[PDB]
Write an enzyme that holds these catalytic residues in place. Structure first.
Site, PDB file in Angstrom:
ATOM      1  N   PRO A   1       0.844  -1.221   0.000  1.00 26.27           N
ATOM      2  CA  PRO A   1       0.000   0.000   0.000  1.00 26.27           C
ATOM      3  C   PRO A   1       0.865   1.251   0.000  1.00 26.27           C
ATOM      4  O   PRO A   1       1.996   1.234   0.482  1.00 26.27           O
ATOM      5  CB  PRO A   1      -0.873  -0.073   1.239  1.00 26.27           C
ATOM      6  CG  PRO A   1      -1.016  -1.600   1.391  1.00 26.27           C
ATOM      7  CD  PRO A   1       0.382  -2.147   1.049  1.00 26.27           C
ATOM      8  N   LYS A  32      -1.664  -5.821   5.558  1.00 25.07           N
ATOM      9  CA  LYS A  32      -0.453  -6.089   4.786  1.00 25.07           C
ATOM     10  C   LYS A  32       0.768  -5.856   5.670  1.00 25.07           C
ATOM     11  O   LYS A  32       0.745  -5.004   6.561  1.00 25.07           O
ATOM     12  CB  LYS A  32      -0.377  -5.164   3.567  1.00 25.07           C
ATOM     13  CG  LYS A  32      -1.013  -5.703   2.292  1.00 25.07           C
ATOM     14  CD  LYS A  32      -2.505  -5.897   2.420  1.00 25.07           C
ATOM     15  CE  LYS A  32      -3.086  -6.456   1.132  1.00 25.07           C
ATOM     16  NZ  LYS A  32      -2.787  -5.573  -0.031  1.00 25.07           N
ATOM     17  N   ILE A  64      -3.338  -2.863  -3.663  1.00 29.22           N
ATOM     18  CA  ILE A  64      -3.759  -3.932  -4.564  1.00 29.22           C
ATOM     19  C   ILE A  64      -4.767  -4.701  -3.720  1.00 29.22           C
ATOM     20  O   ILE A  64      -4.398  -5.504  -2.859  1.00 29.22           O
ATOM     21  CB  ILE A  64      -2.571  -4.832  -4.976  1.00 29.22           C
ATOM     22  CG1 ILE A  64      -1.584  -4.007  -5.808  1.00 29.22           C
ATOM     23  CG2 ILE A  64      -3.064  -5.994  -5.827  1.00 29.22           C
ATOM     24  CD1 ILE A  64      -0.240  -4.690  -6.030  1.00 29.22           C
ATOM     25  N   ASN A  97      -8.345  10.050  -1.717  1.00 22.51           N
ATOM     26  CA  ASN A  97      -8.750   9.305  -2.900  1.00 22.51           C
ATOM     27  C   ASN A  97      -8.228   7.879  -2.741  1.00 22.51           C
ATOM     28  O   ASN A  97      -7.046   7.684  -2.467  1.00 22.51           O
ATOM     29  CB  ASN A  97      -8.153   9.934  -4.170  1.00 22.51           C
ATOM     30  CG  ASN A  97      -8.852  11.220  -4.571  1.00 22.51           C
ATOM     31  OD1 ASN A  97      -8.234  12.133  -5.126  1.00 22.51           O
ATOM     32  ND2 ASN A  97     -10.145  11.292  -4.308  1.00 22.51           N
TER      33      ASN A  97
HETATM   34  O1  OX4 Z   1     -15.703  16.445  -3.511  1.00 17.41           O
HETATM   35  C1  OX4 Z   1     -15.512  15.853  -4.528  1.00 17.41           C
HETATM   36  O2  OX4 Z   1     -16.304  16.122  -5.620  1.00 17.41           O
HETATM   37  N1  OX4 Z   1     -17.510  15.436  -5.858  1.00 17.41           N
HETATM   38  C2  OX4 Z   1     -18.673  15.913  -5.517  1.00 17.41           C
HETATM   39  C3  OX4 Z   1     -19.908  15.115  -5.825  1.00 17.41           C
HETATM   40  C4  OX4 Z   1     -20.927  15.667  -6.654  1.00 17.41           C
HETATM   41  C5  OX4 Z   1     -22.081  14.918  -6.959  1.00 17.41           C
HETATM   42  C6  OX4 Z   1     -22.233  13.606  -6.443  1.00 17.41           C
HETATM   43  O3  OX4 Z   1     -23.345  12.880  -6.740  1.00 17.41           O
HETATM   44  C7  OX4 Z   1     -21.230  13.049  -5.616  1.00 17.41           C
HETATM   45  F1  OX4 Z   1     -21.377  11.838  -5.144  1.00 17.41           F
HETATM   46  C8  OX4 Z   1     -20.064  13.801  -5.304  1.00 17.41           C
HETATM   47  C9  OX4 Z   1     -14.400  14.808  -4.609  1.00 17.41           C
HETATM   48  C10 OX4 Z   1     -13.183  15.259  -3.730  1.00 17.41           C
HETATM   49  C11 OX4 Z   1     -12.048  14.192  -3.802  1.00 17.41           C
HETATM   50  C12 OX4 Z   1     -11.578  14.023  -5.273  1.00 17.41           C
HETATM   51  C13 OX4 Z   1     -12.781  13.567  -6.155  1.00 17.41           C
HETATM   52  C14 OX4 Z   1     -13.921  14.642  -6.085  1.00 17.41           C
HETATM   53  O1  OX4 Z   2       2.202  -3.059  -1.797  1.00 18.93           O
HETATM   54  C1  OX4 Z   2       1.125  -2.802  -2.247  1.00 18.93           C
HETATM   55  O2  OX4 Z   2       0.012  -3.394  -1.698  1.00 18.93           O
HETATM   56  N1  OX4 Z   2      -0.473  -4.634  -2.149  1.00 18.93           N
HETATM   57  C2  OX4 Z   2      -0.181  -5.765  -1.566  1.00 18.93           C
HETATM   58  C3  OX4 Z   2      -0.767  -7.034  -2.121  1.00 18.93           C
HETATM   59  C4  OX4 Z   2      -1.611  -7.848  -1.305  1.00 18.93           C
HETATM   60  C5  OX4 Z   2      -2.169  -9.035  -1.825  1.00 18.93           C
HETATM   61  C6  OX4 Z   2      -1.894  -9.423  -3.166  1.00 18.93           C
HETATM   62  O3  OX4 Z   2      -2.438 -10.565  -3.671  1.00 18.93           O
HETATM   63  C7  OX4 Z   2      -1.059  -8.623  -3.979  1.00 18.93           C
HETATM   64  F1  OX4 Z   2      -0.813  -8.990  -5.217  1.00 18.93           F
HETATM   65  C8  OX4 Z   2      -0.491  -7.427  -3.461  1.00 18.93           C
HETATM   66  C9  OX4 Z   2       0.994  -1.827  -3.413  1.00 18.93           C
HETATM   67  C10 OX4 Z   2       2.067  -0.691  -3.285  1.00 18.93           C
HETATM   68  C11 OX4 Z   2       1.939   0.301  -4.484  1.00 18.93           C
HETATM   69  C12 OX4 Z   2       0.520   0.937  -4.484  1.00 18.93           C
HETATM   70  C13 OX4 Z   2      -0.557  -0.186  -4.615  1.00 18.93           C
HETATM   71  C14 OX4 Z   2      -0.427  -1.180  -3.415  1.00 18.93           C
END
Ligand code: OX4
Ligand code: OX4
Lengths: 114, 114, 114
Positions: A1, A32, A64, A97
Protein backbone atom coordinates in the site's frame (compact mmCIF):
# COMPACT_ATOMS: atom_id res chain seq x y z
CA UNK A 1 0.00 0.00 0.00
CA UNK A 2 1.05 3.59 -0.64
CA UNK A 3 -0.31 6.56 1.33
CA UNK A 4 0.41 10.17 0.35
CA UNK A 5 -0.59 13.30 2.29
CA UNK A 6 -0.28 16.80 0.82
CA UNK A 7 -1.00 19.57 3.34
CA UNK A 8 -0.58 23.31 3.91
CA UNK A 9 0.42 22.55 7.52
CA UNK A 10 4.07 23.65 8.15
CA UNK A 11 6.89 21.09 8.24
CA UNK A 12 7.66 22.05 11.84
CA UNK A 13 4.12 21.01 12.77
CA UNK A 14 4.63 17.42 11.57
CA UNK A 15 5.60 15.51 14.74
CA UNK A 16 8.59 13.20 15.04
CA UNK A 17 7.56 9.63 14.32
CA UNK A 18 4.63 10.56 12.10
CA UNK A 19 5.76 8.48 9.12
CA UNK A 20 6.39 5.48 11.38
CA UNK A 21 2.93 5.84 12.96
CA UNK A 22 1.28 5.97 9.53
CA UNK A 23 3.25 2.89 8.46
CA UNK A 24 2.18 0.92 11.55
CA UNK A 25 -1.41 1.95 11.48
CA UNK A 26 -1.75 1.26 7.77
CA UNK A 27 -0.14 -2.16 8.12
CA UNK A 28 -2.72 -2.93 10.81
CA UNK A 29 -5.67 -1.50 8.88
CA UNK A 30 -4.88 -3.10 5.51
CA UNK A 31 -3.59 -6.38 6.92
CA UNK A 32 -0.45 -6.09 4.79
CA UNK A 33 3.07 -6.45 6.24
CA UNK A 34 4.63 -3.09 7.19
CA UNK A 35 7.56 -3.95 4.89
CA UNK A 36 5.20 -3.31 1.94
CA UNK A 37 3.83 0.01 3.19
CA UNK A 38 5.08 3.27 1.69
CA UNK A 39 4.18 6.66 3.15
CA UNK A 40 4.84 10.18 1.89
CA UNK A 41 4.05 13.49 3.62
CA UNK A 42 4.29 16.82 1.79
CA UNK A 43 3.95 19.87 4.07
CA UNK A 44 3.98 23.62 3.38
CA UNK A 45 1.75 23.31 0.34
CA UNK A 46 -0.10 26.13 -1.38
CA UNK A 47 -3.65 24.79 -1.21
CA UNK A 48 -7.22 25.71 -0.36
CA UNK A 49 -10.23 23.65 0.63
CA UNK A 50 -13.67 25.19 0.13
CA UNK A 51 -11.96 28.46 -0.77
CA UNK A 52 -10.25 28.60 2.64
CA UNK A 53 -6.56 28.36 3.48
CA UNK A 54 -7.14 26.95 6.98
CA UNK A 55 -5.36 23.61 7.60
CA UNK A 56 -6.42 20.95 5.11
CA UNK A 57 -5.10 17.82 3.42
CA UNK A 58 -5.42 16.11 0.04
CA UNK A 59 -4.43 12.44 0.26
CA UNK A 60 -4.40 9.19 -1.65
CA UNK A 61 -4.23 5.53 -0.65
CA UNK A 62 -3.30 3.02 -3.35
CA UNK A 63 -3.59 -0.69 -2.61
CA UNK A 64 -3.76 -3.93 -4.56
CA UNK A 65 -7.09 -5.05 -3.17
CA UNK A 66 -8.33 -4.26 0.35
CA UNK A 67 -10.28 -1.34 -1.13
CA UNK A 68 -14.06 -1.14 -0.88
CA UNK A 69 -17.06 0.58 0.67
CA UNK A 70 -16.72 -0.58 4.28
CA UNK A 71 -12.93 -0.76 4.24
CA UNK A 72 -12.61 2.77 2.88
CA UNK A 73 -14.91 4.13 5.58
CA UNK A 74 -12.68 2.45 8.16
CA UNK A 75 -9.51 3.83 6.51
CA UNK A 76 -11.02 7.31 6.49
CA UNK A 77 -11.86 7.19 10.19
CA UNK A 78 -8.33 6.04 10.98
CA UNK A 79 -6.53 8.52 8.73
CA UNK A 80 -8.69 11.55 9.51
CA UNK A 81 -8.21 10.69 13.18
CA UNK A 82 -4.43 10.67 12.77
CA UNK A 83 -4.41 13.90 10.76
CA UNK A 84 -6.61 15.59 13.36
CA UNK A 85 -4.59 14.39 16.35
CA UNK A 86 -1.11 14.86 14.87
CA UNK A 87 -1.46 17.73 12.40
CA UNK A 88 -4.54 19.45 13.88
CA UNK A 89 -6.46 19.19 10.61
CA UNK A 90 -10.25 19.07 10.86
CA UNK A 91 -11.65 15.85 9.32
CA UNK A 92 -14.06 17.88 7.20
CA UNK A 93 -11.09 19.52 5.45
CA UNK A 94 -9.56 16.22 4.34
CA UNK A 95 -10.08 14.38 1.05
CA UNK A 96 -8.62 10.89 0.55
CA UNK A 97 -8.75 9.30 -2.90
CA UNK A 98 -8.74 5.49 -2.77
CA UNK A 99 -7.37 3.43 -5.65
CA UNK A 100 -7.77 -0.33 -6.01
CA UNK A 101 -4.74 -1.15 -8.20
CA UNK A 102 -4.44 -4.25 -10.38
CA UNK A 103 -1.25 -6.15 -9.57
CA UNK A 104 -0.14 -5.89 -13.21
CA UNK A 105 -0.30 -2.10 -12.93
CA UNK A 106 2.11 -1.79 -10.00
CA UNK A 107 5.82 -1.88 -10.71
CA UNK A 108 8.37 -2.93 -8.10
CA UNK A 109 11.82 -4.52 -8.08
CA UNK A 110 12.29 -4.42 -11.89
CA UNK A 111 8.93 -6.07 -12.62
CA UNK A 112 5.30 -5.85 -11.46
CA UNK A 113 3.27 -7.66 -8.81
CA UNK A 114 1.41 -9.69 -11.44
CA UNK B 1 -13.82 18.32 -6.86
CA UNK B 2 -10.05 18.47 -6.44
CA UNK B 3 -7.74 20.29 -8.87
CA UNK B 4 -3.96 20.02 -8.67
CA UNK B 5 -1.41 21.90 -10.78
CA UNK B 6 2.30 21.04 -10.80
CA UNK B 7 4.44 23.49 -12.76
CA UNK B 8 8.03 24.62 -13.32
CA UNK B 9 6.83 28.24 -13.23
CA UNK B 10 8.37 30.13 -10.22
CA UNK B 11 6.30 30.73 -7.07
CA UNK B 12 6.71 34.49 -7.53
CA UNK B 13 4.98 34.15 -10.91
CA UNK B 14 1.80 32.75 -9.35
CA UNK B 15 -0.49 35.80 -8.93
CA UNK B 16 -2.18 36.51 -5.62
CA UNK B 17 -5.77 35.31 -5.76
CA UNK B 18 -4.97 32.41 -8.09
CA UNK B 19 -6.28 29.71 -5.74
CA UNK B 20 -9.48 31.70 -5.16
CA UNK B 21 -9.98 32.16 -8.90
CA UNK B 22 -9.52 28.44 -9.55
CA UNK B 23 -12.00 27.66 -6.76
CA UNK B 24 -14.65 30.03 -8.13
CA UNK B 25 -14.18 28.97 -11.76
CA UNK B 26 -14.26 25.27 -10.90
CA UNK B 27 -17.39 25.70 -8.80
CA UNK B 28 -19.04 27.33 -11.81
CA UNK B 29 -17.76 24.77 -14.33
CA UNK B 30 -18.60 21.65 -12.31
CA UNK B 31 -21.82 22.98 -10.82
CA UNK B 32 -20.79 22.16 -7.24
CA UNK B 33 -20.69 24.46 -4.18
CA UNK B 34 -17.32 26.16 -3.64
CA UNK B 35 -17.21 24.59 -0.17
CA UNK B 36 -16.46 21.22 -1.83
CA UNK B 37 -13.75 22.51 -4.16
CA UNK B 38 -10.12 21.85 -3.23
CA UNK B 39 -7.24 23.40 -5.19
CA UNK B 40 -3.50 22.79 -4.95
CA UNK B 41 -0.73 24.59 -6.85
CA UNK B 42 2.88 23.36 -6.80
CA UNK B 43 5.39 25.76 -8.41
CA UNK B 44 9.15 25.58 -8.95
CA UNK B 45 9.03 21.97 -10.11
CA UNK B 46 11.76 20.10 -11.97
CA UNK B 47 9.84 19.01 -15.06
CA UNK B 48 10.01 18.85 -18.83
CA UNK B 49 7.38 18.58 -21.54
CA UNK B 50 8.46 17.21 -24.90
CA UNK B 51 12.01 17.29 -23.57
CA UNK B 52 11.81 21.05 -23.10
CA UNK B 53 12.05 22.96 -19.83
CA UNK B 54 9.99 25.91 -21.10
CA UNK B 55 6.92 26.67 -18.91
CA UNK B 56 4.60 23.67 -18.64
CA UNK B 57 2.08 22.11 -16.28
CA UNK B 58 0.93 18.62 -15.27
CA UNK B 59 -2.52 18.71 -13.66
CA UNK B 60 -5.34 16.53 -12.45
CA UNK B 61 -9.03 17.09 -11.79
CA UNK B 62 -10.85 14.52 -9.65
CA UNK B 63 -14.62 14.67 -9.33
CA UNK B 64 -17.44 12.38 -8.30
CA UNK B 65 -19.32 12.54 -11.59
CA UNK B 66 -19.36 15.57 -13.90
CA UNK B 67 -16.59 13.93 -15.91
CA UNK B 68 -17.03 13.02 -19.56
CA UNK B 69 -16.14 13.75 -23.17
CA UNK B 70 -17.85 17.12 -23.62
CA UNK B 71 -17.39 18.24 -20.03
CA UNK B 72 -13.66 17.48 -20.07
CA UNK B 73 -13.21 19.47 -23.28
CA UNK B 74 -14.91 22.41 -21.58
CA UNK B 75 -12.79 21.98 -18.42
CA UNK B 76 -9.64 21.91 -20.54
CA UNK B 77 -10.54 25.14 -22.34
CA UNK B 78 -11.24 26.83 -19.00
CA UNK B 79 -8.13 25.58 -17.20
CA UNK B 80 -5.68 25.99 -20.08
CA UNK B 81 -7.07 29.50 -20.47
CA UNK B 82 -6.42 30.28 -16.81
CA UNK B 83 -2.93 28.78 -16.88
CA UNK B 84 -2.10 30.75 -20.02
CA UNK B 85 -3.46 34.05 -18.72
CA UNK B 86 -2.21 33.78 -15.13
CA UNK B 87 0.96 31.67 -15.37
CA UNK B 88 1.87 32.34 -19.01
CA UNK B 89 1.91 28.64 -19.87
CA UNK B 90 1.15 27.67 -23.45
CA UNK B 91 -1.95 25.42 -23.68
CA UNK B 92 0.02 22.92 -25.76
CA UNK B 93 2.39 22.37 -22.83
CA UNK B 94 -0.35 21.41 -20.38
CA UNK B 95 -1.66 17.93 -19.56
CA UNK B 96 -4.75 17.51 -17.36
CA UNK B 97 -5.70 14.01 -16.20
CA UNK B 98 -9.41 13.69 -15.41
CA UNK B 99 -10.69 11.14 -12.90
CA UNK B 100 -14.33 10.20 -12.40
CA UNK B 101 -14.26 8.98 -8.78
CA UNK B 102 -16.82 6.61 -7.26
CA UNK B 103 -18.31 8.14 -4.10
CA UNK B 104 -17.23 5.05 -2.13
CA UNK B 105 -13.62 5.75 -3.11
CA UNK B 106 -13.46 9.29 -1.74
CA UNK B 107 -12.84 9.74 1.97
CA UNK B 108 -13.88 12.86 3.85
CA UNK B 109 -14.86 13.74 7.41
CA UNK B 110 -14.05 10.30 8.91
CA UNK B 111 -16.08 8.39 6.29
CA UNK B 112 -16.65 8.39 2.52
CA UNK B 113 -19.19 10.06 0.25
CA UNK B 114 -20.99 6.78 -0.39
CA UNK C 1 2.97 9.74 -21.55
CA UNK C 2 3.61 11.35 -18.17
CA UNK C 3 6.18 10.02 -15.68
CA UNK C 4 6.50 11.37 -12.14
CA UNK C 5 9.06 10.35 -9.54
CA UNK C 6 8.90 11.43 -5.90
CA UNK C 7 11.96 10.54 -3.84
CA UNK C 8 13.72 11.27 -0.56
CA UNK C 9 17.04 11.44 -2.45
CA UNK C 10 18.48 15.00 -2.26
CA UNK C 11 18.27 17.42 -5.20
CA UNK C 12 22.06 17.53 -5.44
CA UNK C 13 22.06 13.78 -6.05
CA UNK C 14 19.91 14.06 -9.16
CA UNK C 15 22.44 14.12 -12.05
CA UNK C 16 22.35 16.74 -14.77
CA UNK C 17 20.54 15.38 -17.82
CA UNK C 18 18.27 13.10 -15.80
CA UNK C 19 15.03 14.56 -17.15
CA UNK C 20 16.33 14.32 -20.72
CA UNK C 21 17.37 10.69 -20.20
CA UNK C 22 13.94 9.80 -18.83
CA UNK C 23 12.29 11.52 -21.78
CA UNK C 24 14.39 9.70 -24.38
CA UNK C 25 14.13 6.31 -22.69
CA UNK C 26 10.37 6.62 -22.23
CA UNK C 27 9.93 7.68 -25.86
CA UNK C 28 11.80 4.52 -26.85
CA UNK C 29 9.96 2.22 -24.44
CA UNK C 30 6.43 3.45 -25.13
CA UNK C 31 6.93 4.06 -28.85
CA UNK C 32 5.22 7.41 -28.30
CA UNK C 33 6.58 10.54 -30.03
CA UNK C 34 9.18 12.27 -27.79
CA UNK C 35 7.27 15.56 -27.95
CA UNK C 36 4.37 13.96 -26.07
CA UNK C 37 6.52 12.82 -23.14
CA UNK C 38 6.31 14.75 -19.85
CA UNK C 39 8.63 14.01 -16.92
CA UNK C 40 8.62 15.33 -13.36
CA UNK C 41 11.14 14.63 -10.60
CA UNK C 42 10.51 15.65 -6.98
CA UNK C 43 13.53 15.22 -4.66
CA UNK C 44 14.04 15.88 -0.94
CA UNK C 45 10.74 14.28 0.02
CA UNK C 46 9.69 13.17 3.48
CA UNK C 47 8.87 9.53 2.80
CA UNK C 48 9.40 6.00 4.06
CA UNK C 49 9.23 2.61 2.39
CA UNK C 50 8.68 -0.39 4.65
CA UNK C 51 9.08 1.97 7.59
CA UNK C 52 12.62 2.82 6.49
CA UNK C 53 13.94 6.22 5.40
CA UNK C 54 16.69 4.74 3.21
CA UNK C 55 16.53 5.95 -0.43
CA UNK C 56 13.21 5.08 -2.05
CA UNK C 57 10.88 6.32 -4.76
CA UNK C 58 7.13 6.49 -5.40
CA UNK C 59 6.36 6.96 -9.09
CA UNK C 60 3.57 6.95 -11.64
CA UNK C 61 3.39 6.49 -15.39
CA UNK C 62 0.23 7.61 -17.17
CA UNK C 63 -0.28 6.76 -20.83
CA UNK C 64 -3.12 6.53 -23.33
CA UNK C 65 -2.68 2.87 -24.17
CA UNK C 66 0.68 1.06 -24.16
CA UNK C 67 -0.13 -0.17 -20.65
CA UNK C 68 -0.39 -3.87 -19.88
CA UNK C 69 1.11 -6.87 -18.14
CA UNK C 70 4.18 -7.43 -20.32
CA UNK C 71 4.70 -3.76 -21.15
CA UNK C 72 4.56 -2.72 -17.50
CA UNK C 73 7.14 -5.35 -16.57
CA UNK C 74 9.42 -3.90 -19.24
CA UNK C 75 8.79 -0.32 -18.07
CA UNK C 76 9.59 -1.34 -14.49
CA UNK C 77 12.89 -2.94 -15.49
CA UNK C 78 13.83 0.20 -17.42
CA UNK C 79 12.78 2.72 -14.78
CA UNK C 80 14.09 0.83 -11.74
CA UNK C 81 17.33 0.44 -13.67
CA UNK C 82 17.56 4.19 -14.24
CA UNK C 83 16.67 5.02 -10.64
CA UNK C 84 19.27 2.54 -9.39
CA UNK C 85 22.03 3.77 -11.70
CA UNK C 86 21.32 7.51 -11.49
CA UNK C 87 19.83 8.02 -8.01
CA UNK C 88 21.28 4.94 -6.28
CA UNK C 89 17.83 3.71 -5.23
CA UNK C 90 17.42 -0.03 -4.76
CA UNK C 91 14.78 -1.48 -7.12
CA UNK C 92 13.02 -3.13 -4.19
CA UNK C 93 12.35 0.30 -2.67
CA UNK C 94 10.54 1.62 -5.73
CA UNK C 95 6.80 1.55 -6.48
CA UNK C 96 5.49 2.63 -9.88
CA UNK C 97 1.74 3.01 -10.41
CA UNK C 98 0.69 2.51 -14.04
CA UNK C 99 -2.44 4.15 -15.42
CA UNK C 100 -4.02 3.40 -18.80
CA UNK C 101 -5.83 6.68 -19.51
CA UNK C 102 -8.83 7.01 -21.83
CA UNK C 103 -8.14 9.68 -24.47
CA UNK C 104 -11.29 11.52 -23.38
CA UNK C 105 -9.87 11.84 -19.87
CA UNK C 106 -6.65 13.60 -20.84
CA UNK C 107 -6.76 17.33 -21.43
CA UNK C 108 -4.22 19.13 -23.60
CA UNK C 109 -4.15 22.30 -25.71
CA UNK C 110 -7.63 23.58 -24.70
CA UNK C 111 -9.28 20.19 -25.42
CA UNK C 112 -8.79 16.47 -24.87
CA UNK C 113 -7.29 13.73 -27.01
CA UNK C 114 -10.81 12.18 -27.84
O1 OX4 D 1 -15.70 16.45 -3.51
C1 OX4 D 1 -15.51 15.85 -4.53
O2 OX4 D 1 -16.30 16.12 -5.62
N1 OX4 D 1 -17.51 15.44 -5.86
C2 OX4 D 1 -18.67 15.91 -5.52
C3 OX4 D 1 -19.91 15.11 -5.83
C4 OX4 D 1 -20.93 15.67 -6.65
C5 OX4 D 1 -22.08 14.92 -6.96
C6 OX4 D 1 -22.23 13.61 -6.44
O3 OX4 D 1 -23.35 12.88 -6.74
C7 OX4 D 1 -21.23 13.05 -5.62
F1 OX4 D 1 -21.38 11.84 -5.14
C8 OX4 D 1 -20.06 13.80 -5.30
C9 OX4 D 1 -14.40 14.81 -4.61
C10 OX4 D 1 -13.18 15.26 -3.73
C11 OX4 D 1 -12.05 14.19 -3.80
C12 OX4 D 1 -11.58 14.02 -5.27
C13 OX4 D 1 -12.78 13.57 -6.16
C14 OX4 D 1 -13.92 14.64 -6.09
O1 OX4 E 1 2.20 -3.06 -1.80
C1 OX4 E 1 1.12 -2.80 -2.25
O2 OX4 E 1 0.01 -3.39 -1.70
N1 OX4 E 1 -0.47 -4.63 -2.15
C2 OX4 E 1 -0.18 -5.77 -1.57
C3 OX4 E 1 -0.77 -7.03 -2.12
C4 OX4 E 1 -1.61 -7.85 -1.31
C5 OX4 E 1 -2.17 -9.03 -1.83
C6 OX4 E 1 -1.89 -9.42 -3.17
O3 OX4 E 1 -2.44 -10.57 -3.67
C7 OX4 E 1 -1.06 -8.62 -3.98
F1 OX4 E 1 -0.81 -8.99 -5.22
C8 OX4 E 1 -0.49 -7.43 -3.46
C9 OX4 E 1 0.99 -1.83 -3.41
C10 OX4 E 1 2.07 -0.69 -3.29
C11 OX4 E 1 1.94 0.30 -4.48
C12 OX4 E 1 0.52 0.94 -4.48
C13 OX4 E 1 -0.56 -0.19 -4.62
C14 OX4 E 1 -0.43 -1.18 -3.41
Amino acid sequence: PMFIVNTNVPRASVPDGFLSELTQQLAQATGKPPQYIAVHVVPDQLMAFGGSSEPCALCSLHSIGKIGGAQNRSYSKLLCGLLAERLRISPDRVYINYYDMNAANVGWNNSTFA
